[PDB]
Amino acid sequence: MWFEILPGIAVMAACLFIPGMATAHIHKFTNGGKEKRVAHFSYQWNLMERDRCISGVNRYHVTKGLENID
Amino acid sequence: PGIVELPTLEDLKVQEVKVSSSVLKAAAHHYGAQCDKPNKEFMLCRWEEKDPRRCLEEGKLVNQCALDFFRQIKRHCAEPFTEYWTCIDYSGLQLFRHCRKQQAKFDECVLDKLGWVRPDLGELSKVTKVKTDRPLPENPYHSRARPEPNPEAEGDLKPAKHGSRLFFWTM
Numbered sequence: 001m002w003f004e005i006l007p008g009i010a011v012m013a014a015c016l017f018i019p020g021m022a023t024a025h026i027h028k029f030t031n032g033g034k035e036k037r038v039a040h041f042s043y044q045w046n047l048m049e050r051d052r053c054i055s056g057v058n059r060y061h062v063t064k065g066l067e068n069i070d
Numbered sequence: 071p072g073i074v075e076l077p078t079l080e081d082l083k084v085q086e087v088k089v090s091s092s093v094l095k096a097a098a099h100h101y102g103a104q105c106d107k108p109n110k111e112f113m114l115c116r117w118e119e120k121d122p123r124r125c126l127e128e129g130k131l132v133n134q135c136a137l138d139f140f141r142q143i144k145r146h147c148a149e150p151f152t153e154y155w156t157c158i159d160y161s162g163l164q165l166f167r168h169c170r171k172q173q174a175k176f177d178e179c180v181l182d183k184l185g186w187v188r189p190d191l192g193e194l195s196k197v198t199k200v201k202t203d204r205p206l207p208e209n210p211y212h213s214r215a216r217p218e219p220n221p222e223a224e225g226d227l228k229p230a231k232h233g234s235r236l237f238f239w240t241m
Contacts, residue, residue: 035162047091054088063090063159065152066144069137070085 032061081126084133089140092159096151097143099188100180105139108132110200120210147179 027036037060039045048060055062094101102109112128119125143151154172158164166173180186233241 034160037164038162051090054090063092065089065093065155066140066148068088069140069144 032059034061037061075123077123077126082129084130085137087133087136087140090155090159092164093155095164096155096158096176097139099194100143100186101136101139102194103189104186105132105135106198107200108135110198111202114200114202115204118210119207142184143180146183147176150175150179 028034031037037044037048039048051060051063052058054064054068108128108131112125112132115125115128116122122129150172154169154176157169157172158166161168177186177188233239
């Protein structure tokens with residue numbers, strides 16, 4: 001007769017749902033759809049900085065491949 | 071006191087290869103396989119001379135060879151490489167683990183279009199021997215002349231003259 005208990009979790013589940021999606025979506029929105037690149041070590045940060053430099057528009061997520069080179 | 075000599079801006083005017091880190095990571099193994107000579111020569115110059123103001127020409131030549139590699143991959147396997155590097159770029163950590171099918175397409179394309187094979191595990195991390203023609207830096211650290219060693223102690227030992235020679239103690 002505990003189904004009356006179930007709404008309490010339900011809305012609460014929604015509560016615990018809200019951050020986990022939002023951050024992910026934010027990480028996709030602010031970084032051009034792709035996952036936020038994580039720099040756990042200096043090499044990754046150097047790669048990110050070189051990406052920011054090459055992009056020309058000063059955003060690391062903007063990526064250039066074969067079209068950029070001759 | 072001295073001169074901080076710096077090569078003028080003309081020498082370091084390389085063509086500046088422009089591909090993102092994900093694109094570089096996608097072609098990592100094949101580039102390392104088919105571009106090892108310029109990288110190895112440039113790094114041996116860097117480690118031996120210990121002066122980036124000296125091995126700039128090797129830095130030019132490595133970029134030239136990298137641009138040649140990327141031009142070849144553009145000319146022969148543009149589509150699989152594009153899809154592979156995009157799928158690498160999606161990942162936050164840029165892991166090869168999730169992207170294996172696109173890796174297979176890229177590998178077979180370059181194998182049957184440019185005669186390439188990916189290095190096996192650990193092949194790209196073996197110490198290589200380069201046949202560079204530059205001389206060996208005699209003084210890489212620019213060390214000055216070392217002080218002369220202290221006069222060496224040698225010779226037979228005889229009993230101390232007149233014993234201890236400490237006050238009235240004769241012996």
